[PDB]
Amino acid sequence: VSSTKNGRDSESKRLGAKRADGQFVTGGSILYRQRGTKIYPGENVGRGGDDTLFAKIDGVVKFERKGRDKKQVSVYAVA
Amino acid sequence: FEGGQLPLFRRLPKRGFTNINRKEYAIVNLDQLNKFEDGTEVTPALLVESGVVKNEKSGIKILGNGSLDKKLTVKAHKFSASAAEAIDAKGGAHEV
Amino acid sequence: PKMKTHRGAAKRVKRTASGQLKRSRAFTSHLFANKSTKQKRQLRKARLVSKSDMKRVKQLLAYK
RNA sequence: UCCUAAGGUAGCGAAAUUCCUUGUCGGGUAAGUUCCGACCCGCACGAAAGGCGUAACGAUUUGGGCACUGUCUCAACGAGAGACUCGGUGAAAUCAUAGUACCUGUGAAGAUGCAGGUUACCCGCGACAGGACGGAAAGACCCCGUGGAGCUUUACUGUAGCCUGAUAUUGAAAUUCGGCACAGCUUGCCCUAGCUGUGUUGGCUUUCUAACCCGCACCACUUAUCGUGGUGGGAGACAGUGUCAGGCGGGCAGUUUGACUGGGGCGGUCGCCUCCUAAAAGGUAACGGAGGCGCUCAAAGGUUCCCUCAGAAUGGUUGGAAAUCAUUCAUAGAGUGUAAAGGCAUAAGGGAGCUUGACUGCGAGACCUACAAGUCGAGCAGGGUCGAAAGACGGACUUAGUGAUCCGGUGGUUCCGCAUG
RNA sequence: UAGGCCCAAGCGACUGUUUAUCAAAAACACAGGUCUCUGCUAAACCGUAAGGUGAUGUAUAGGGGCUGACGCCUGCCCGGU
RNA sequence: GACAAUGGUAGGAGAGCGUUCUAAGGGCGUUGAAGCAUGAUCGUAAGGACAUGUGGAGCGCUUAGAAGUGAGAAUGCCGGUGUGAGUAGCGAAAGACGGGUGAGAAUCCCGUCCACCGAUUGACUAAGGUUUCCAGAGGAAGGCUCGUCCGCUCUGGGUUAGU
RNA sequence: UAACUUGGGAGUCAGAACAUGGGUGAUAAGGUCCGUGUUCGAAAGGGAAACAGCCCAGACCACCAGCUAAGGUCCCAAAAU
RNA sequence: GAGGGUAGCGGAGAAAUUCCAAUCGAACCUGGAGAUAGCUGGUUCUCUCCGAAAUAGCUUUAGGGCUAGCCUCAAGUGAUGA
RNA sequence: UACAAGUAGUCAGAGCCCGUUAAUGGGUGAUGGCGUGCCUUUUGUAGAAUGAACCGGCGAGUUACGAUUUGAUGCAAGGUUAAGCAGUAAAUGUGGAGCCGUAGCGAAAGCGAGUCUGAAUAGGGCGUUUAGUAUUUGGUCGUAGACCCGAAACCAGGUGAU
RNA sequence: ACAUAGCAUAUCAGAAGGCACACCCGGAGAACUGAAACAUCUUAGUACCCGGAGGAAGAGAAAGAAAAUUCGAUUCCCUUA
Numbered sequence A: 001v002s003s004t005k006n007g008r009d010s011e012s013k014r015l016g017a018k019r020a021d022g023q024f025v026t027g028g029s030i031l032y033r034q035r036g037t038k039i040y041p042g043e044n045v046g047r048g049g050d051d052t053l054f055a056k057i058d059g060v061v062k063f064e065r066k067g068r069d070k071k072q073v074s075v076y077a078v079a
Numbered sequence B: 001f002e003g004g005q006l007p008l009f010r011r012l013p014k015r016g017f018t019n020i021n022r023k024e025y026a027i028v029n030l031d032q033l034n035k036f037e038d039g040t041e042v043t044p045a046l047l048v049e050s051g052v053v054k055n056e057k058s059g060i061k062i063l064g065n066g067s068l069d070k071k072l073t074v075k076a077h078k079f080s081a082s083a084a085e086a087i088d089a090k091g092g093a094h095e096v
Numbered sequence C: 001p002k003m004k005t006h007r008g009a010a011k012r013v014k015r016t017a018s019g020q021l022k023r024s025r026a027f028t029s030h031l032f033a034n035k036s037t038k039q040k041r042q043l044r045k046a047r048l049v050s051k052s053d054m055k056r057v058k059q060l061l062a063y064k
Numbered sequence D: 001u002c003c004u005a006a007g008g009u010a011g012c013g014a015a016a017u018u019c020c021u022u023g024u025c026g027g028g029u030a031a032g033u034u035c036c037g038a039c040c041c042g043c044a045c046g047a048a049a050g051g052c053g054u055a056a057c058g059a060u061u062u063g064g065g066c067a068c069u070g071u072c073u074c075a076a077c078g079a080g081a082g083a084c085u086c087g088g089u090g091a092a093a094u095c096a097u098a099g100u101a102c103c104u105g106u107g108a109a110g111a112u113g114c115a116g117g118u119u120a121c122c123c124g125c126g127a128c129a130g131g132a133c134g135g136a137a138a139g140a141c142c143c144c145g146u147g148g149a150g151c152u153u154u155a156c157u158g159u160a161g162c163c164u165g166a167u168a169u170u171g172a173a174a175u176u177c178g179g180c181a182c183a184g185c186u187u188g189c190c191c192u193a194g195c196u197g198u199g200u201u202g203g204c205u206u207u208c209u210a211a212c213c214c215g216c217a218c219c220a221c222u223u224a225u226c227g228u229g230g231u232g233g234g235a236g237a238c239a240g241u242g243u244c245a246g247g248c249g250g251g252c253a254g255u256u257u258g259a260c261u262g263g264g265g266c267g268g269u270c271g272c273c274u275c276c277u278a279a280a281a282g283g284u285a286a287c288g289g290a291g292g293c294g295c296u297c298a299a300a301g302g303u304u305c306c307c308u309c310a311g312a313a314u315g316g317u318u319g320g321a322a323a324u325c326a327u328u329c330a331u332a333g334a335g336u337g338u339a340a341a342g343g344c345a346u347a348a349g350g351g352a353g354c355u356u357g358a359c360u361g362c363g364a365g366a367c368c369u370a371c372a373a374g375u376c377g378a379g380c381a382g383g384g385u386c387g388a389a390a391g392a393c394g395g396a397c398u399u400a401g402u403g404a405u406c407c408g409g410u411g412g413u414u415c416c417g418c419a420u421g
Numbered sequence E: 001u002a003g004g005c006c007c008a009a010g011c012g013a014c015u016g017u018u019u020a021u022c023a024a025a026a027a028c029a030c031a032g033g034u035c036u037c038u039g040c041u042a043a044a045c046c047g048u049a050a051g052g053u054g055a056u057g058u059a060u061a062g063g064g065g066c067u068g069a070c071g072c073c074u075g076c077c078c079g080g081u
Numbered sequence F: 001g002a003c004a005a006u007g008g009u010a011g012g013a014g015a016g017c018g019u020u021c022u023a024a025g026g027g028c029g030u031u032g033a034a035g036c037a038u039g040a041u042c043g044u045a046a047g048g049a050c051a052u053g054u055g056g057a058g059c060g061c062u063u064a065g066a067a068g069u070g071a072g073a074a075u076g077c078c079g080g081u082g083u084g085a086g087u088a089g090c091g092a093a094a095g096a097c098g099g100g101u102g103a104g105a106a107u108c109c110c111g112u113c114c115a116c117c118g119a120u121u122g123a124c125u126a127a128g129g130u131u132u133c134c135a136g137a138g139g140a141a142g143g144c145u146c147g148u149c150c151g152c153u154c155u156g157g158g159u160u161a162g163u
Numbered sequence G: 001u002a003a004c005u006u007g008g009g010a011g012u013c014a015g016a017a018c019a020u021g022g023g024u025g026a027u028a029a030g031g032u033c034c035g036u037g038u039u040c041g042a043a044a045g046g047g048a049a050a051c052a053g054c055c056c057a058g059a060c061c062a063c064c065a066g067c068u069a070a071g072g073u074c075c076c077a078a079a080a081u
Numbered sequence H: 001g002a003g004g005g006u007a008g009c010g011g012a013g014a015a016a017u018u019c020c021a022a023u024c025g026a027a028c029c030u031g032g033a034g035a036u037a038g039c040u041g042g043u044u045c046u047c048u049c050c051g052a053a054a055u056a057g058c059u060u061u062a063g064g065g066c067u068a069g070c071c072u073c074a075a076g077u078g079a080u081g082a
Numbered sequence I: 001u002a003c004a005a006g007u008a009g010u011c012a013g014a015g016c017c018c019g020u021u022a023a024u025g026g027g028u029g030a031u032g033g034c035g036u037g038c039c040u041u042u043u044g045u046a047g048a049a050u051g052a053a054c055c056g057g058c059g060a061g062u063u064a065c066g067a068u069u070u071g072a073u074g075c076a077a078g079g080u081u082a083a084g085c086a087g088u089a090a091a092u093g094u095g096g097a098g099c100c101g102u103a104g105c106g107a108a109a110g111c112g113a114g115u116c117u118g119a120a121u122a123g124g125g126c127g128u129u130u131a132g133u134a135u136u137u138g139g140u141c142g143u144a145g146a147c148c149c150g151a152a153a154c155c156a157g158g159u160g161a162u
Numbered sequence J: 001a002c003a004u005a006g007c008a009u010a011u012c013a014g015a016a017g018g019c020a021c022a023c024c025c026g027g028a029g030a031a032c033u034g035a036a037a038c039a040u041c042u043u044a045g046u047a048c049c050c051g052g053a054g055g056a057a058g059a060g061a062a063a064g065a066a067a068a069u070u071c072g073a074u075u076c077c078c079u080u081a
């Protein structure tokens, strides 16, 4: 009589920022989980096979403008 | 029991076997040997009587934890390389 | 009477120096074509029984 | 003409069967959803789970008459038992304590007991039953419990029993037909189609009598239709019985037969991926709104080098609105294996050369997280591919494409090996 | 003290039988029909067996299934089980 | 001295009250123990004293130990007693009067009349019961009232077979 | 003025209304499903006639003392006819 | 009517789940036995301090359970909390 | 106490009657304010949801053996005995077999303050760089009916056809 | 037929039956239950029934245990665990 063909959804993936601008992070810490490059890897930051941005060195996170429309995240060593 | 969720000790697998001929040795370290007077002939019987070793298990093995400060003649079923070296270096002797 | 050891758990764990329980890993039986090289390599490595599981199961292995 | 094993005959039919339906028509009545007669578009009759009739019969069901009447119009009176009063005797269910009003409201949404009003001097007796969601019975309907029981079956697993073969009890003989091997001949070292013997190996069939059997006769024990023994007859290595085996086996047994759910059933759904709902971190429900997955690729992977689209306008043959060619414009409207989203024109898109990193040991640190798992990861070592080199490479633009343990198979192994090898 | 009667229709032929204690009926039974098994230590049935019922019977008999007096009848399909 | 905290269901934590028994110490008691009853008593609570009456022989207190250690509810179990209530009921029917008896009479006995059954409410008798039968005595209980009476109570009797 | 770690003991897994951001339903429900806050739950006291969930406000005990909150001050009924 | 026979995994049934000693879809008694009950009911003195949850995940799971979350007690750390 | 609307009390309070564990007393209560029992179960019960007529007695986390944790105590790189024997059914003596600890790591051979993985003197897992042990109070768990009462049923052997 | 059934007589402190709801040995042998369902498995060789005892029964003087300097019937307790 009546039924819905809907009622499906996948598990949420907990994307987004994992560390704050200005925060100290150790090498390897994930900085940003994403699909595609919504944010680009900056200095001392790598981009894993699934587009995750992670720090390569110990240091301070900094989210920065990349040109006019894009942005990146970098990690800088503390003095 | 986990209310019907497959319990931990069924979702995990079994590992290994037990050796029928497994040997385990009563262990004595050099720091424990330090209680016998220099020149002593330390033997399994002496270790048991002195109370250093209670259960002899498959035999006495000498191990190298601590420092030996005495010259001894040590008779045991087994020696660690380090234990034998320390016993010899303190002027003593060892024999299996 | 004496409490009885859980024999399956005893076949699946070993007690470490600090009293923890070393365990092997699930997903290591078959269907290896469906798990990545990295997955299988790391599933090769043993773990410990979690604290939350230990609360539940510790009496089963009191003699272990 | 399609299909079937074959397409319902006679009789009967709005029926103990007709939903629609009070079918329609006729009869009966002043008026008839019932009844009788007829009709036949039989939702969904029909020939031994018998069809259609049928005298007699029926505490059977049904409709109509006459008679009859307190059934009724519409009630009245009278007799007796109880009720009532007095003497005697004297229970019961029920019961948190009770000085136990009504109305409108309030409230677990229907109040003696709460609010605000209204009404009401204290205590009996005969009566009535509106309420005390009155008493009586831990609702029998409904659902639920990994409850019970009886029942069914082409649910599962069994089993009494039956059938069938081997073998033991179990012996004698003859004929006849095969498998294997040797040898001889034999027709197109050995093949093919055959033949006669030679050796065990075995089938089928008969015959015999001595095992075994006779709820057959006679004889004795013995006054006995039991039993035992004897004799004759019948039967006979069969049957019966033991062990083993295959088949059949709701006859009988033990059980299973999911959950969610705007009650349950029925329908739908159940794991994984993407989006919206989701309230600009993350997370976030409904049987809310939309779609995908259970793969694919030997290149559609790695690396080096090179390249840039879709569309439009204008010319041009077969050629048209779109095929292929040319110029210009064209910033992404193309493409990115496959849903969506996020990305990608410094390409992640397109082409080519060479290649196999779609490596081995790992792994600081981190995300996610109840657990088990899931995800990312620099960097180190080994040995490589492409590149002049820097360097890139532990699959694919990213996120689905999957399943624990137990058990078993296969390969490898400087592990173990129940006195020792 | 001692039948009410009559006209019709459905069902069951009939006399019987039944839910002791909410159902007496159109249900069961029935005489009749038919199918089927059974050659006698019968088949069927009870029992582990012995021993029994069947039957001190023998196919005009015995068990089981279905139908249900009587009258007129009982069509087609053997692909499936 | 100051000033801070102290609502609370599931539930966690703490400190305590009281019951029976045991050990040791120290006490009380026929000049009256426990129990019970009453009182205007004391402590923050569980609870502890005291006085008086009843009672008539056992019992506190201190420290420690040990538990059948605390009830208001289980349609709880057993007992007692209420309520309903002087209420329902007193189980098919015809009695009336006279005379007795008696502490007492609708109810026992006797009489007369009346009424009921009479294919029977009569007469036998098999089962079944087992003394209920008879005589004298009784009136607690039983008898649905009463009771002088009884299938009840007491006492003593009673059943005879060759057919 | 908490927080975290380790260890002993738990209970809980039926939630309600109200306000507000939304789905669903009908911009229906004392409806239903999520987000956020409060209260009830487990909270007495004052107000809202009465009125778990609204408003004020969190009861250690005593007082025949004072000031206030919400809400109120003609009489019931404390306080302004 | 009398005397007898058939007995519960069974009898008996002109068939109703019908009877087998006043309730028969399997009599009655005793035993296994305190079957099992993820259900309902009940669970006894006092004060003091703290004080929840009605959620997630998985579950032949949905009024049950497990781990997490939230309470409590203790020890530790030491400003790491608001 | 006969003009009154009652979960029956509570707080306020005249009148009347008394006189005590002598305390800023006892009994009664005209009249005023406030006020819908208790338990259970619930989101929420005055609930018209459940239970109890009343009173009394009786009526529900226990014990054994194991585990774990905490407190206590003795001894401490040690700690401790079991059965048995002796003893008064005792304390206790004796009994060192055994158990736990003093060393871990590995599936194992084995090596050992290290070991496993690994080709690796790399990296990583578990360890080392003191404290245990015996008895016992408390808490909790396991095996036992395991806090108490309650099925419908299942099985076994008997008893019944008055 | 021989004598074998059979039959008759005599002897026997021969047997029988009971129970202590215990213990022992043996025959035969459940189910509720646990497995959060259920069949293997468990309950359990338990309950019940039956036979046989004895004061105890059963077992017992190695076709044993082992792996050294071997031990030397059986039974029972501790431990191994």
Ligand SMILES: [Mg+2]
Binding pocket: A010, A011, A012, A013
């Ligand atoms: Mg998503």
Ligand SMILES: [Mg+2]
Binding pocket: A049, A050
């Ligand atoms: Mg990738």
Ligand SMILES: [Mg+2]
Binding pocket: C028, C029
């Ligand atoms: Mg493998």
Ligand SMILES: [Mg+2]
Binding pocket: none
């Ligand atoms: Mg008609």
Ligand SMILES: [Mg+2]
Binding pocket: none
């Ligand atoms: Mg028909």
Ligand SMILES: [Mg+2]
Binding pocket: D050
């Ligand atoms: Mg037919």
Ligand SMILES: [Mg+2]
Binding pocket: none
């Ligand atoms: Mg017929």
Ligand SMILES: [Mg+2]
Binding pocket: none
């Ligand atoms: Mg008749």
Ligand SMILES: [Mg+2]
Binding pocket: D082
């Ligand atoms: Mg009268």
Ligand SMILES: [Mg+2]
Binding pocket: none
């Ligand atoms: Mg009277």
Ligand SMILES: [Mg+2]
Binding pocket: none
């Ligand atoms: Mg009540």
Ligand SMILES: [Mg+2]
Binding pocket: D107, D109
């Ligand atoms: Mg209302």
Ligand SMILES: [Mg+2]
Binding pocket: none
């Ligand atoms: Mg009122």
Ligand SMILES: [Mg+2]
Binding pocket: none
């Ligand atoms: Mg009622």
Ligand SMILES: [Mg+2]
Binding pocket: D138
């Ligand atoms: Mg009920």
Ligand SMILES: [Mg+2]
Binding pocket: none
């Ligand atoms: Mg069945």
